[PDB]
């Protein structure tokens, strides 16, 4: 039988009328420069593919940081190089602002423009509910940016989101995950963080695409809105789906299954049994009343689907009423 191929309701095409230059980062060119220009100041943290530096450049002593990769293949260094200079200038997106490689250890590194982050364990404790529409709505002008041009994120979460709440301006990063979306493309479904992962990711379902940030995005205004961080709280791959299922019931799930003809790992048979789709009020409690309204769960209701294409894209994503309050307020200031 087979899976049921699957295309992206928009931006499905896009890269096949770039010039090939644009999304084939195998052939890419880069030049190095040198880090010598860069002093490191402090380590701002770590990960599993890089080490984090806050550096100065010691040309014009302006803050910046600096990203020394792990050892990944150099085509998915370039991968990450191309995206983020074909993304280059786009709202709310990090700039890549030089590529420079160790002159002794001979190990890649980026530099990226300095950002004041909070990090979210301070930070969404303190966001009011405008603040969260706000700052939803700066992320969706990157999610939709970047699907234009695309590319395909595929890491949303409140990690790779540096926020400068005193400025109110926002920063999405750590784009080492993205790819080039193309129609009909396979695409490994071990990527994202396991509480952020899409059930295509879980379900074993590579025929995916823009939307699986989206649901990525839901994932997170929910632990926002909710104040339950993470919201599916799955102790591996396969109980993360029944997290969502005991959520999101049973029945779309199977549903979902059947219409792409989706081979269920056997290892589902036992855990998944069968769930009613809870509504949303379950969730609402003295603490968190405030930040949840009939607009926020009908915004995230859209946002948490099964299936991919039932999911809101970006852009219909922004023309939601849980943003026009954030929308008006954009206008005035023009
Ligand atoms: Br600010 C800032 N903080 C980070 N922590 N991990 N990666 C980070 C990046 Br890229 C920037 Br820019």
Known sequence: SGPVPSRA???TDVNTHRPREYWDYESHVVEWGNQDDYQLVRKLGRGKYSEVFEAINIT???????????????????REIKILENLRGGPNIITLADIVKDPVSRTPALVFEHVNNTDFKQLYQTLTDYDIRFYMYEILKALDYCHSMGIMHRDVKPHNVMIDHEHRKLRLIDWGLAEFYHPGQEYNVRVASRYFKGPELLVDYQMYDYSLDMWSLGCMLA???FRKEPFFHGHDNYDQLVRI???????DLYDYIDKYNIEL??????????????????????????????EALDFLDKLLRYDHQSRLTAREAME???????????????
Request: glycine share 4%.
């Open 9 to 11: 309701r928009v931006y």
């Open 60 to 78: 014009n002593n302006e803050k910046v940081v600096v990203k020394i990769l792990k050892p990944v293949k150099k085509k998915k260094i370039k």
């Open 265 to 294: 790992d056997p290892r589902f048979n036992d855990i998944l049994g069968r769930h009613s789709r809870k509504r949303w009020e379950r969730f609402v409690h003295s603490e968190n009343q405030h930040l949840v309204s009939p």
């Open 245 to 251: 299922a005991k959520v999101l019931g049973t029945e």
């Open 320 to 334: 939601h009423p849980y943003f026009y309050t954030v929308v008006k307020d954009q206008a005035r200031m023009g």
């Open 223 to 225: 632990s926002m809105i």
